[PDB]
Scaffold this active site. Structure first.
Site, short mmCIF file in Angstrom:
data_model
loop_
_atom_site.label_atom_id
_atom_site.label_comp_id
_atom_site.label_asym_id
_atom_site.label_seq_id
_atom_site.Cartn_x
_atom_site.Cartn_y
_atom_site.Cartn_z
N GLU A 64 0.82 -1.21 0.00
CA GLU A 64 0.00 0.00 0.00
C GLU A 64 0.85 1.26 0.00
N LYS B 43 -17.51 -0.60 6.72
CA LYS B 43 -17.97 -1.68 5.84
C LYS B 43 -19.49 -1.71 5.73
N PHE C 21 -11.33 -6.49 14.84
CA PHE C 21 -10.36 -7.12 13.95
C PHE C 21 -9.92 -6.14 12.87
N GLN C 22 -8.62 -5.85 12.85
CA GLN C 22 -8.01 -4.96 11.86
C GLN C 22 -8.62 -3.56 11.93
N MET D 123 24.00 9.53 0.96
CA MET D 123 23.83 10.82 1.62
C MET D 123 24.30 10.77 3.07
C1 LIG Z 1 -6.77 -13.85 9.17
C2 LIG Z 1 -6.93 -13.97 10.70
C3 LIG Z 1 -7.83 -14.89 11.23
C4 LIG Z 1 -7.96 -15.00 12.64
N1 LIG Z 1 -8.83 -15.91 13.13
C5 LIG Z 1 -8.74 -16.21 14.45
C6 LIG Z 1 -9.38 -17.34 15.00
O1 LIG Z 1 -10.15 -18.20 14.20
N2 LIG Z 1 -9.25 -17.60 16.30
C7 LIG Z 1 -8.53 -16.80 17.07
O2 LIG Z 1 -8.42 -17.11 18.43
N3 LIG Z 1 -7.90 -15.73 16.60
C8 LIG Z 1 -7.99 -15.41 15.29
N4 LIG Z 1 -7.35 -14.32 14.82
C9 LIG Z 1 -6.49 -13.51 15.73
C10 LIG Z 1 -7.29 -12.35 16.39
O3 LIG Z 1 -8.03 -11.44 15.58
C11 LIG Z 1 -6.98 -11.95 17.86
O4 LIG Z 1 -5.65 -11.57 17.94
C12 LIG Z 1 -7.28 -13.13 18.79
O5 LIG Z 1 -8.52 -13.67 18.49
C13 LIG Z 1 -7.37 -12.62 20.25
O6 LIG Z 1 -6.23 -13.09 20.99
P1 LIG Z 1 -6.41 -13.14 22.66
O7 LIG Z 1 -7.87 -13.42 22.97
O8 LIG Z 1 -5.51 -14.21 23.23
O9 LIG Z 1 -5.98 -11.66 23.33
P2 LIG Z 1 -4.45 -10.98 23.24
O10 LIG Z 1 -4.38 -10.07 22.03
O11 LIG Z 1 -3.41 -12.07 23.15
O12 LIG Z 1 -4.17 -10.08 24.64
C14 LIG Z 1 -3.93 -10.78 25.87
C15 LIG Z 1 -5.00 -10.54 26.75
O13 LIG Z 1 -4.67 -11.08 28.13
C16 LIG Z 1 -4.37 -10.11 28.97
N5 LIG Z 1 -3.11 -10.37 29.59
C17 LIG Z 1 -1.92 -10.13 29.07
N6 LIG Z 1 -0.98 -10.50 29.93
C18 LIG Z 1 -1.57 -10.99 31.03
C19 LIG Z 1 -1.13 -11.53 32.26
N7 LIG Z 1 0.29 -11.64 32.54
N8 LIG Z 1 -2.03 -11.92 33.15
C20 LIG Z 1 -3.33 -11.83 32.91
N9 LIG Z 1 -3.79 -11.33 31.77
C21 LIG Z 1 -2.94 -10.91 30.82
C22 LIG Z 1 -4.32 -8.68 28.13
O14 LIG Z 1 -4.88 -7.61 28.97
C23 LIG Z 1 -5.23 -8.98 26.95
O15 LIG Z 1 -6.66 -8.73 27.31
C24 LIG Z 1 -7.21 -14.20 13.47
C25 LIG Z 1 -6.31 -13.27 12.93
C26 LIG Z 1 -6.17 -13.16 11.54
C27 LIG Z 1 -5.19 -12.15 10.93
C1 LIG Z 2 18.14 15.14 0.39
C2 LIG Z 2 17.37 16.42 0.04
C3 LIG Z 2 18.05 17.60 -0.23
C4 LIG Z 2 17.33 18.77 -0.55
N1 LIG Z 2 18.02 19.90 -0.82
C5 LIG Z 2 17.36 20.92 -1.41
C6 LIG Z 2 18.03 22.01 -2.00
O1 LIG Z 2 19.43 22.09 -2.00
N2 LIG Z 2 17.33 22.99 -2.56
C7 LIG Z 2 16.00 22.94 -2.58
O2 LIG Z 2 15.29 23.98 -3.19
N3 LIG Z 2 15.32 21.93 -2.04
C8 LIG Z 2 15.98 20.91 -1.45
N4 LIG Z 2 15.28 19.89 -0.90
C9 LIG Z 2 13.79 19.86 -1.02
C10 LIG Z 2 13.10 20.54 0.20
O3 LIG Z 2 13.44 20.14 1.53
C11 LIG Z 2 11.81 21.37 -0.02
O4 LIG Z 2 10.84 20.54 -0.56
C12 LIG Z 2 12.10 22.56 -0.94
O5 LIG Z 2 13.25 23.21 -0.53
C13 LIG Z 2 10.95 23.59 -0.84
O6 LIG Z 2 10.19 23.59 -2.05
P1 LIG Z 2 9.30 24.98 -2.36
O7 LIG Z 2 10.03 26.16 -1.76
O8 LIG Z 2 9.13 25.14 -3.85
O9 LIG Z 2 7.78 24.85 -1.65
P2 LIG Z 2 6.63 23.69 -2.05
O10 LIG Z 2 6.79 22.50 -1.12
O11 LIG Z 2 6.80 23.27 -3.49
O12 LIG Z 2 5.10 24.36 -1.86
C14 LIG Z 2 4.64 25.33 -2.81
C15 LIG Z 2 4.51 26.57 -2.18
O13 LIG Z 2 3.82 27.56 -3.10
C16 LIG Z 2 2.57 27.77 -2.74
N5 LIG Z 2 1.69 27.55 -3.84
C17 LIG Z 2 1.26 26.38 -4.27
N6 LIG Z 2 0.47 26.57 -5.32
C18 LIG Z 2 0.39 27.88 -5.58
C19 LIG Z 2 -0.26 28.68 -6.54
N7 LIG Z 2 -1.11 28.08 -7.56
N8 LIG Z 2 -0.10 30.00 -6.49
C20 LIG Z 2 0.66 30.57 -5.57
N9 LIG Z 2 1.29 29.85 -4.65
C21 LIG Z 2 1.18 28.52 -4.63
C22 LIG Z 2 2.21 26.74 -1.49
O14 LIG Z 2 1.34 27.44 -0.53
C23 LIG Z 2 3.57 26.46 -0.89
O15 LIG Z 2 3.94 27.53 0.09
C24 LIG Z 2 15.95 18.75 -0.59
C25 LIG Z 2 15.26 17.56 -0.31
C26 LIG Z 2 15.97 16.40 0.01
C27 LIG Z 2 15.23 15.09 0.31
C1 LIG Z 3 22.59 12.72 6.46
O1 LIG Z 3 21.76 13.20 5.45
C2 LIG Z 3 21.36 14.53 5.64
C3 LIG Z 3 20.86 15.24 4.60
C4 LIG Z 3 20.48 16.53 4.79
O2 LIG Z 3 19.96 17.28 3.73
C5 LIG Z 3 20.52 16.98 2.48
N1 LIG Z 3 20.60 17.08 5.99
C6 LIG Z 3 21.10 16.36 7.02
N2 LIG Z 3 21.23 16.95 8.34
C7 LIG Z 3 20.19 17.81 8.86
O3 LIG Z 3 19.22 18.05 8.23
N3 LIG Z 3 20.33 18.38 10.18
S1 LIG Z 3 19.09 19.39 10.76
O4 LIG Z 3 19.01 20.58 9.91
O5 LIG Z 3 19.31 19.58 12.19
N4 LIG Z 3 17.60 18.58 10.57
C8 LIG Z 3 16.40 19.36 10.36
S2 LIG Z 3 17.46 16.90 10.86
C9 LIG Z 3 16.93 16.68 12.57
O6 LIG Z 3 18.77 16.26 10.76
O7 LIG Z 3 16.40 16.43 9.96
N5 LIG Z 3 21.48 15.08 6.83
#
Ligand SMILES: Cc1cc2nc3c(=O)[nH]c(=O)nc-3n(C[C@H](O)[C@H](O)[C@H](O)COP(=O)(O)OP(=O)(O)OC[C@H]3O[C@@H](n4cnc5c(N)ncnc54)[C@H](O)[C@@H]3O)c2cc1C
Ligand SMILES: Cc1cc2nc3c(=O)[nH]c(=O)nc-3n(C[C@H](O)[C@H](O)[C@H](O)COP(=O)(O)OP(=O)(O)OC[C@H]3O[C@@H](n4cnc5c(N)ncnc54)[C@H](O)[C@@H]3O)c2cc1C
Ligand SMILES: COc1cc(OC)nc(NC(=O)NS(=O)(=O)N(C)S(C)(=O)=O)n1
Ligand SMILES: Cc1ncc(C[n+]2c([C@@](C)(O)OO)sc(CCOP(=O)(O)OP(=O)(O)O)c2C)c(N)n1
Ligand SMILES: Cc1ncc(C[n+]2c([C@@](C)(O)OO)sc(CCOP(=O)(O)OP(=O)(O)O)c2C)c(N)n1
Ligand SMILES: Cc1ncc(C[n+]2c([C@@](C)(O)OO)sc(CCOP(=O)(O)OP(=O)(O)O)c2C)c(N)n1
Ligand SMILES: COc1cc(OC)nc(NC(=O)NS(=O)(=O)N(C)S(C)(=O)=O)n1
Ligand SMILES: [Mg+2]
Ligand SMILES: [Mg+2]
Ligand SMILES: [Mg+2]
Ligand SMILES: [Mg+2]
Ligand SMILES: [Mg+2]
Ligand SMILES: [Mg+2]
Ligand SMILES: [Mg+2]
Lengths: 582, 582, 287
Positions: free
Chosen positions: B59, B171, B121-122, B485
Site C-alpha cells: 500500500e 464496511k 479485527f483490523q 547521503m
Molecule cells: C486472518 C486472521 C484470522 C484469525 N482468526 C482467528 C481465530 O479463528 N481464532 C482466534 O483465536 N484468533 C484469530 N485471529 C487472531 C485475532 O483477531 C486476535 O488476535 C485473537 O482472536 C485474540 O487473541 P487473545 O484473545 O488471546 O488476546 P491478546 O491479544 O493475546 O491479549 C492478551 C490478553 O490477556 C491479557 N493479559 C496479558 N498478559 C496478562 C497476564 N500476565 N495476566 C493476565 N492477563 C494478561 C491482556 O490484557 C489482553 O486482554 C485471526 C487473525 C487473523 C489475521
Molecule cells: C536530500 C534532500 C536535499 C534537498 N536539498 C534541497 C536544496 O538544496 N534545494 C531545494 O530547493 N530543495 C531541497 N530539498 C527539497 C526541500 O526540503 C523542499 O521541498 C524545498 O526546498 C521547498 O520547495 P518549495 O520552496 O518550492 O515549496 P513547495 O513544497 O513546493 O510548496 C509550494 C509553495 O507555493 C505555494 N503555492 C502552491 N500553489 C500555488 C499557486 N497556484 N499559487 C501561488 N502559490 C502557490 C504553497 O502554498 C507552498 O507555500 C531537498 C530535499 C531532500 C530530500
Molecule cells: C545525512 O543526510 C542529511 C541530509 C540533509 O539534507 C541533504 N541534511 C542532514 N542533516 C540535517 O538536516 N540536520 S538538521 O538541519 O538539524 N535537521 C532538520 S534533521 C533533525 O537532521 O532532519 N542530513
C-alpha cells in the site's frame, strides 16, 4: 554493578546517554536505520561494545523484526528510526504491537526543538500521529530527561499489559553535552497505583468452588498465558479441563496433548467451538473476547458461567460480562488456585471424563481435514511435514492469510513463544522480518517463516538483511499465486468474482509469477521450488539441513479454503465445514 | 451529461455509490489493494467500465504511485486500502503528499460503525492517526453522505494549496442500499470564504514598481509555479530577471536557458545562492522559504526587498518577513504583471544586463563540476548522458539521497511535471512506485526512475506491478553500495566513521550486493549492469530502445560527494565547493 | 483507602456503566444493566423461594443497632446559640420531611444530609461529584418550576449563597415559593474545619465578614432579599428558631431566613482523606 564507558563527572553527548540508558536496561540488540535526525544515535551505537545493531532494509522491517525479537523471547524489542519518513514507516509495527500487546520500545529522531512545528526538513509530528496506536509516547525536551524517559519507556512497555512505547528525540538533545543522573525516580504515580495487586484468596476460592459445581468446563486460554505454561499445565493436571486456545495463545498448552481442543474461533476446530457453545463454566484466562473468537456475542458461551482473569481492568466486562472476575496476573492466579486444588484434592473429587468424552466424540467426527488432489501439494500437508521433520520444536513466524491459518491448525506448538503471528492487526509482511528478530534472539533455534506469496513480497527486501547478518532463517513459502484469504471470501460471499486478488501475470497465466527463487538468488540465499507432493518431504528436509538461509517455494492449488469457517458475526450453528472454489 | 449504470430510482450499495462518485469526478485510474474492510469497494470497481485499478504489491507503493500519477499530470491521485494494516501502510505517502502539496484522495475501509472503538479485527483509528499529516480527513457515518464527502474530498485536495484528503468508509456503509443525491451542496463555508481572491491591481503595480527601482533582482521560483510555466516564461521575457528554482520548482523555467540559475539552496549551484545573497529584490513566487533553501534565515537575502506571492496565507511571513506580499494564485499574479510590463514597456526601460553578467561570471568560475576517475562511472555523467539520449523530455522520478541531488543538478528539465521527487518529507522508496503512476498517467512518455540502491530496494516489490501492468518504466539505478547521503555526512562531520551505511555483504566486500539484476529477473524485467564508463552510453541507449520495462544497474564509486554543499543552518560564506571521501 | 474498604466482603456491583465495574474496587459478582430491572428480577426469586431460603439477619442487625445507639449523630448546644444541626432538624419536623431540599457546598451541605430524613428520592438536590458552591439557590429555582405545589427550601451557606445571589431577582420575577434557610457562620466553614484539624487553626482567607466590624454580621443578607422584594428575617436565639422557620414556611412566596450559627462547629464524624474506619474522628471542634 554497571560499568560505564564514561567517568561519572565527564560530560557526554545526549546520544551517548541514550545508548548507555539502553545498556542499563539489558539491551543487546537494536534494529536501527540511519538518517539525518538520528545520526548522532547511530554514532553512539558504534561506541557501544554490548549493543549490536541489525540494519534492516526498511523501517517497517525494523519494527517487525523488533516484534519477532520480543515475541520469541519475552524481552522488549527495540527499533530505531530517523525523523519523517523513517518514523512514519514504523506506524504499521506500532499499531501491530499495541493490538497484540507486544513489549516494544521505538526511538525516533526528531528535528531540533527550535524547528518543531515549522514544517522543517523531514519533520512529522510522530507523537501526535502515534498517540492512538501506542501504549504511550514521549517527546524529550531536555537532555536531562533521557535517563528517566528511557526507564519509564521500558517499564511501561514491559509491565502490566505490554505494548509499544515511542520516544521522540530531537537532534539538538542528542548533541547537547550533559552528565546523566541515573538515580531519578520515575514519574508514573497514577499508572503504578493502578497496577493490579496479587489476587486475593477469596476470589480464588470462588473459582475453584465453581469448578467443582460445574459439569462442562472449558479453558479459554489466550496470549495472556505466554508466561504461564508451567502453571497452566499444572492447573490442567489438577482439574482435567479441556483447553481451547486463541491464535495468540497457541503453545501455552501443548497442541499434541489429549486434553487440547486446539484453536477456537472463526477458523478454530469444530470441537473447540462446540465445547464453548455447550459449556457451563468458561475459564477465560488471558484473553480479550475478540470477535474472531466470539462472533455474535449473545450466542457465545450462552450457557456458561464466565470467569475472566485479565491484567487490564478495561478488558473485564468489555464485550462479554462475566460472573466472577479477577484483575491481576494470571500467572499468580494459577499458582494460587493450584495450591487450593492440591490440598483440597481428595475433598473435591474432580472428574470431567463424561464431558471430555462428549468432546472426544466431536473430535473424531469433525476433525481438521484436508483433501489431496492428484500430485498437487496440499498446503496443510506441507505444514504437517514441517512439524514432523522439526519435531515441533521450531519457531514459526507467518504472514497473514490462508497460510497463516494452516500454520496455526497443522502445527503442534509445544511451548509458547514458538508462534509469532500478527493476530490483532493482521499485518501482511510480518513473517519475514519477525523471523529475523526471532533468529537473532534465538541463534541456536530452528526459525521457519511460513509466508504467503503476497505477504512475503511486501517486505522481500529483508532477504538482504538475512544474508548480511548470516541468519539461519528458513522460508516455507506457500505459493498459491493469489491473495488467498480474500479469494476465499470472494468464492463464498461474492460468487467467485475476482476483484484484484490474482498476484501472477495474466499474460503468462500458468507461469509462477513472480519467480521467488530469483529474489533469494539476488540476496545470495539458496532456494528451491517443489510442485509434486512426493518431492515435498525431501525438499523440506533439504531446507532444514542446508546451513544458513533457505527459501522453499511450495506451489499449492489456489482453490483451497481454510476450514472450518464461521462467517463474520455468526454463531456455532453457522459453521461451514466443507467446500472450496472448484 | 453523466451516464450512470443505475436507474435514478434504483437503490444501490454504498460501495457502488462511492465508485460512481469517483466516476463523476473524472477518475480513470485508482491504486487499490483489497482487504476485508474494502472488499465491497473492490467488487464495485469491477462493475465500473471507466475506472481501471492498478494493483500494487504494497500500500505504500499504492500511495506513492498515486503521487506520481498526480505530480506528472496535475490530476488528483486516488489510492484505496483496507482497514488496519492497509491504512497504516499509507501513512508515509499521506505525510509526503502533505509536505509537497500534492493533490491526493485516499479511501480506506473501516470496521462497521457499531464496532468502532472496540479494538475490533483490523481496526485502527486512521482518522485520528492521519489528522496531522493530511489536509483533511473524514469518517463517513451514513451512506447518504458519500456523494457530499467525496465531492468535498476532491475539492479540498485540488483547490487552493493542494494536499491529501483521506476518507474512512465503514464496511456497513459500503453494504447499505440507498439512492444517492448528487445535487447536495458542499458544507465548506469557512474554507470557501478563506479562498484567496484574484490579485488586486494596486498590489501588482507596486511589484512592477519595485522591479524598475531594483538593480540586482532574482526570481525565487518553487512548486507553486508548476501550472504557470507559460506565464513565468512571459514574465522573464519582459524583465530579464534570472530564475533560481527550488527542488520542487524544477522545470517551471527551462534549466538549459541562458537566464536559468538552476537550483538554489543546500545543494544548489554556487551562482544561484550567490544571486540571492547579493540581491536587492527577491521575487519569491510559489515557495515556502524552506531551511534547505535559506539556511540561517538572518543571512538569507539580507540585502533584498522580498516579494512573496503564495496561495496559503499561513506561509506569508512565516519564516522570512517580506516587504510586499500577495495572497493568491501566482498564475493570475503573473498574468496581471505581464499586462503592466507590456503596456509600460518603453516607459520602464528594464535592463539588468549588468547584474546578469555579474552572475554569468560566477556561473563560469563556479560551475557544477564532477571528477572522472579512471574508467569508473561518474553518477553525474550517467545522468547527463540520460539527458542527452532522451533530449531532456523524459519524466524523471527519484528516490532520496545523493542520486536524488545529481538527478536534479545534471538533468535539464524543459517543462514542469517532469521532475517527481520527494522533497518535503524526503521518503526513500518513492522513485519506483512514482514512476508507475507517472507511466500510467502518461503512457506515451519516457519514464525513468533514477533510484539509489537503498531507496530502490525498499519498494522493490513494485517491480511485479510494472511487469503485470506492462509499463515502460526504465530504472536507472545508481548503485554505490551505500546509503550515500548519510555516508557523505559521516565523511564531513563524523570523521568518516561508518555507522550502518554500507548496504552490501561484508563477507564478500567487493561483490555488488544485492544483485539487483536478479530482482528484475524475478519479475521478468530485462536487466543489465554497466561498470566501465565507455560502455555507459550504449547501455543507457539499450535501456531506452528496449520496449517495456528495463533496469540498468550503474555501478558508481561510493566516495563521490554531492557538491556544492551548505551545512545545516549555514550561510553562503559556509559553502563547501570541493572534496570527497578519499 | 480502597484496600481497607469492605476488606472482608464479597462485593456485588450492579451498574449501567460498564466502565465503573472494577474501576476502583474489583467485585466478585457483577451485573451490567439497569438496577431497577435487577431488583425486579431478584424480588421474584426472593418471593417464590421465600420459605426455601429462610432469610434472617436479625443477629447482624442488632450488632449494628448497638453501634447505632453508642455512636449516633450528635450535636452540642451552647447557651442560646443556634446549632445548625438543630435548625435543619426543626425544618424536617415542620415540613414533615416532604420538602425538596437544595444545598450549597460545605458544612451546611453535610448537616442538611445528616439531619433531614428524606422519604422519597429527588427531594435531595446537592452537588456531590463536583461540589460546586452557588448550586443551592438556582437549583431551588429549577425545582420549584418543575414542582410548583412543593415545599422548596434552599439550605445554603453564606459563601455559597452569595456566589449566585443575583438569582434572587429571578425568584421574585417568576414568583417562585423558594424558601432560603441560610445557615450563616460568617466563614467558609468546611475549609475552616480543615484548618482547625490539619493546619493548627491558621486562618487562610476563610473569614467572610468585615474585619473592621468583626462582630457584625457581614454581609447583611436580609438587604439582598430586600433588594429583590423578598421577605426576609434573621434569627439568632435558639428559642426563636422554631417560630422563625414556621414563619418562613407559612409566608406565601419567597422567603429568606438568616440563621446565625457559631462558626466553631465541626461536621462529625469525619474520616480524613484516604483514611480507614479506624481513623474516624468522632469528637471535637474549634474552641
Ligand atoms: C486472518 C486472521 C484470522 C484469525 N482468526 C482467528 C481465530 O479463528 N481464532 C482466534 O483465536 N484468533 C484469530 N485471529 C487472531 C485475532 O483477531 C486476535 O488476535 C485473537 O482472536 C485474540 O487473541 P487473545 O484473545 O488471546 O488476546 P491478546 O491479544 O493475546 O491479549 C492478551 C490478553 O490477556 C491479557 N493479559 C496479558 N498478559 C496478562 C497476564 N500476565 N495476566 C493476565 N492477563 C494478561 C491482556 O490484557 C489482553 O486482554 C485471526 C487473525 C487473523 C489475521
Ligand atoms: C536530500 C534532500 C536535499 C534537498 N536539498 C534541497 C536544496 O538544496 N534545494 C531545494 O530547493 N530543495 C531541497 N530539498 C527539497 C526541500 O526540503 C523542499 O521541498 C524545498 O526546498 C521547498 O520547495 P518549495 O520552496 O518550492 O515549496 P513547495 O513544497 O513546493 O510548496 C509550494 C509553495 O507555493 C505555494 N503555492 C502552491 N500553489 C500555488 C499557486 N497556484 N499559487 C501561488 N502559490 C502557490 C504553497 O502554498 C507552498 O507555500 C531537498 C530535499 C531532500 C530530500
Ligand atoms: C545525512 O543526510 C542529511 C541530509 C540533509 O539534507 C541533504 N541534511 C542532514 N542533516 C540535517 O538536516 N540536520 S538538521 O538541519 O538539524 N535537521 C532538520 S534533521 C533533525 O537532521 O532532519 N542530513
Ligand atoms: C498489509 C495488508 N494489506 C491487506 C491486508 C488484507 N488481507 C487479508 C486480511 C485477512 O487481513 O483481510 O482483512 S489476507 C490478504 C491476502 C493474503 O495474501 P497471501 O500472503 O498470499 O496469503 P494467502 O495464503 O494466499 O491467503 C489480504 C490482502 C492485510 N491483512 N494486510
Ligand atoms: C524511508 C527513509 N529512511 C531513512 C531516510 C534517511 N536517509 C536520507 C536523508 C537525506 O533523508 O537523511 O535525512 S538519504 C538516505 C540514504 C540514501 O540511500 P540511497 O538510496 O542508496 O541513495 P544514495 O544515492 O546512495 O545517497 C537515508 C538513509 C530517508 N530519507 N527515508
Ligand atoms: C465554587 C467553589 N469554590 C471553592 C470551593 C471549595 N470549598 C469547599 C470544598 C468542600 O469544595 O472544598 O474542596 S466548601 C467551601 C466553603 C463553603 O462555604 P459556605 O457556603 O459558607 O459553607 P459552610 O456551611 O460555611 O461550610 C469552599 C471554599 C467549592 N466547593 N466551590
Ligand atoms: C477477506 O478476508 C477476511 C478475513 C476475515 O477474517 C479471517 N474476515 C473478513 N471479513 C470481516 O472481517 N468482516 S467484518 O467482521 O465486518 N470486519 C471487522 S472488517 C470491516 O471486514 O475488518 N475478511
Ligand atoms: Mg496426505
Ligand atoms: Mg517493501
Ligand atoms: Mg497467497
Ligand atoms: Mg566526463
Ligand atoms: Mg546508495
Ligand atoms: Mg437541642
Ligand atoms: Mg459559611
Amino acid at each position: 554493578t554497571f560499568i560505564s564507558r564514561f567517568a561519572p563527572d565527564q560530560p557526554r553527548k545526549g546520544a551517548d546517554i541514550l545508548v548507555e540508558a539502553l545498556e542499563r536496561q539489558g539491551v543487546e540488540t537494536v534494529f536501527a536505520y540511519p538518517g539525518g535526525a538520528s545520526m548522532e544515535i547511530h554514532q553512539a551505537l558504534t561506541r557501544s561494545s554490548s549493543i549490536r545493531n541489525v540494519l534492516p532494509r526498511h523501517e517497517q522491517g525494523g519494527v517487525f523484526a523488533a516484534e519477532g525479537y520480543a515475541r520469541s523471547s519475552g524481552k522488549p524489542g527495540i527499533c530505531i528510526a530517523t525523523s519523517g519518513p523513517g518514523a512514519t514507516n514504523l506506524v504499521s509495527g506500532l499499531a501491530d504491537a499495541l493490538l497484540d500487546s507486544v513489549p516494544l520500545v521505538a526511538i525516533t529522531g526528531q528535528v531540533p526543538r527550535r524547528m518543531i512545528g515549522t514544517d522543517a526538513f523531514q519533520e512529522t509530528p510522530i507523537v501526535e500521529v502515534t498517540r492512538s496506536i501506542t501504549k504511550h509516547n514521549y517527546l524529550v525536551m531536555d537532555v536531562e530527561d533521557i535517563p528517566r524517559i528511557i526507564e519509564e519507556a521500558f517499564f511501561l512497555a514491559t509491565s502490566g499489559r505490554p505494548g509499544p512505547v515511542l520516544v521522540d528525540v530531537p537532534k539538538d538533545i542528542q548533541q547537547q553535552l550533559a552528565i546523566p543522573n541515573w538515580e531519578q525516580a520515575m514519574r508514573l504515580p497514577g499508572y503504578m497505583s493502578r497496577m493490579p495487586k496479587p489476587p486475593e484468596d477469596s476470589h480464588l476460592e470462588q473459582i475453584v468452588r465453581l469448578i467443582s459445581e460445574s459439569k462442562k468446563p472449558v479453558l479459554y486460554v489466550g496470549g495472556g498465558c505466554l508466561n504461564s505454561s508451567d502453571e497452566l499445565g499444572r492447573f490442567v493436571e489438577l482439574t482435567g479441563i479441556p483447553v481451547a486456545s486463541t491464535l495468540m495463545g497457541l503453545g501455552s498448552y501443548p497442541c499434541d496433548d489429549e486434553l487440547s481442543l486446539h484453536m477456537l474461533g472463526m477458523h478454530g476446530t469444530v470441537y473447540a467451538n462446540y465445547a464453548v457453545e455447550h459449556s457451563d463454566l468458561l475459564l477465560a484466562f488471558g484473553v480479550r473476547f475478540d470477535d474472531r473468537v466470539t462472533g455474535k456475542l449473545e450466542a457465545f458461551a450462552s450457557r456458561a458461567k464466565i470467569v475472566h482473569i485479565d491484567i487490564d481492568s478495561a478488558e473485564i466486562g468489555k464485550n462479554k460480562t462475566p460472573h466472577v472476575s479477577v484483575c491481576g496476573d494470571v500467572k499468580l492466579a494459577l499458582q494460587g488456585m493450584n495450591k487450593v486444588l492440591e490440598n483440597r484434592a481428595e475433598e473435591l473429587k474432580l472428574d470431567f471424563g463424561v464431558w471430555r468424552n462428549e468432546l472426544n466424540v466431536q473430535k473424531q467426527k469433525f476433525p481438521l481435514s484436508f483433501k489431496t488432489f492428484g500430485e498437487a501439494i496440499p498446503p496443510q500437508y506441507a505444514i504437517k511435514v514441517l512439524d514432523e521433520l522439526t519435531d515441533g520444536k521450531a519457531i514459526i513466524s507467518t504472514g497473514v492469510g490462508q497460510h497463516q491459518m494452516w500454520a496455526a491448525q497443522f502445527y503442534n506448538y509445544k511451548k509458547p513463544r514458538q508462534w509469532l503471528s500478527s493476530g490483532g492487526l493482521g499485518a501482511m509482511g510480518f513473517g519475514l522480518p519477525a523471523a529475523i528478530g526471532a533468529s537473532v534472539a534465538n541463534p541456536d533455534a530452528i526459525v521457519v517463516d511460513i509466508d504467503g506469496d503476497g505477504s512475503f513480497i511486501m517486505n522481500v527486501q529483508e532477504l538482504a538483511t538475512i544474508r548480511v547478518e548470516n541468519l539461519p532463517v528458513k522460508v516455507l513459502l506457500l505459493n498459491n499465486q493469489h491473495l488467498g484469504m480474500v479469494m476465499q471470501w470472494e468464492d463464498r460471499f461474492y460468487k467467485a468474482n475476482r476483484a484484484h486478488t490474482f498476484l501472477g501475470d495474466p499474460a503468462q497465466e500458468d507461469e509462477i509469477f513472480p519467480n521467488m527463487l530469483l529474489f533469494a538468488a539476488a540476496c545470495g540465499i539458496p532456494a528451491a521450488r517443489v510442485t509434486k507432493k512426493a518431492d515435498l518431504r525431501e525438499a523440506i528436509q533439504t531446507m532444514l539441513d542446508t546451513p544458513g538461509p533457505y527459501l522453499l517455494d511450495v506451489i499449492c492449488p489456489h482453490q483451497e479454503h481454510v476450514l472450518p469457517m464461521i462467517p463474520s458475526g455468526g454463531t456455532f450453528n453457522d459453521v461451514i465445514t466443507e467446500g472450496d472454489g472448484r
